[PDB]
C-alpha cells in the first residue's frame with residue numbers, strides 16, 4: 001500500500017464502487033486506487049492529539065490535553081454514525097468497526113474503511129456465536145465512540161482478550177471516562193445492551209450527536225487540571 005499521484009493510495013473492489021461516493025465511506029478512484037486520506041487512521045490521530053505528551057510547553061500554556069476540541073471529536077463520531085447509517089440502509093454489515101479502521105480524510109472528514117480477532121470491539125453474541133448484524137456493528141461503534149472520547153485509549157486497558165470472554169456476559173462494560181459528559185457515556189452504554197434489539201440505530205446515534213454538536217456546551221473535556229491523566233495505551 002503506497003501513496004501515488006489527484007491524491008491516491010494504491011493497494012473489496014466491488015464494495016468500494018457499489019457503496020457509492022458516500023463522503024463518510026472510503027471511495028475507489030491487479031491494481032486498484034483508493035481515495036487518499038492525508039491524516040491517516042483515526043486511532044493514531046487521536047493519540048497524536050495528546051499534546052501533554054507531544055508538546056508539554058504548548059499544552060500547559062494553553063491548559064489543554066488535546067489539539068482536537070469536543071466539537072471536532074463529536075464531528076468524527078457524527079461522521080462514523082452517518083456513514084454507518086448508509087451501510088445499514090445498503091444492508092451491509094461491517095464486522096470490523098474500530099477507530100483504527102476510520103481514516104481522517106480531506107477537510108478532516110471521517111471515512112469508514114476496512115484494512116489490516118478484534119475481541120475488544122466485538123459484541124458478546126459475535127464472541128460466542130459468530131452472529132454479526134447492524135446491532136453488533138452498533139456495539140463496536142460504542143467502543144469506537146469510547147476511543148474518540150479517551151483520545152485513542154486501549155479499550156479494557158489492563159485486561160487480556162481472554163478475560164473479556166468471561167467478564168462481558170456477566171455485564172462488565174467500559175467505565176465512564178473522566179472527561180466524558182453523562183449524555184455521551186449514556187449513548188455508549190446503549191450501544192452495549194446484551195439484547196441486540198435494544199441498542200440504538202445508527203440514525204438515532206447520528207441524530208443524538210447532531211443535537212449535542214448544535215448545543216454550544218462542551219461534552220468532552222479537553223481542559224487540563226491537576227490530577228489530569230490520559231486513558232492508557234498497551
Ligand SMILES: Nc1ncnc2c1c(=O)ccn2-c1ccc(NC(=O)Nc2cc(C(F)(F)F)ccc2F)cc1
Nearest residue numbers: 009012015025026034035036037040041112113114115
Ligand atoms: N492514509 C490512507 N489513505 C488511503 N487509504 C489508506 C490509508 C491508510 O493510512 C491505511 C490504509 N488505507 C486503506 C487501505 C485499504 C482500504 N480498503 C478498504 O477499506 N476496503 C474495504 C472497505 C469496506 C467498508 F468499510 F467501506 F465497508 C469494507 C471492506 C473493505 F475491504 C482503504 C484504505
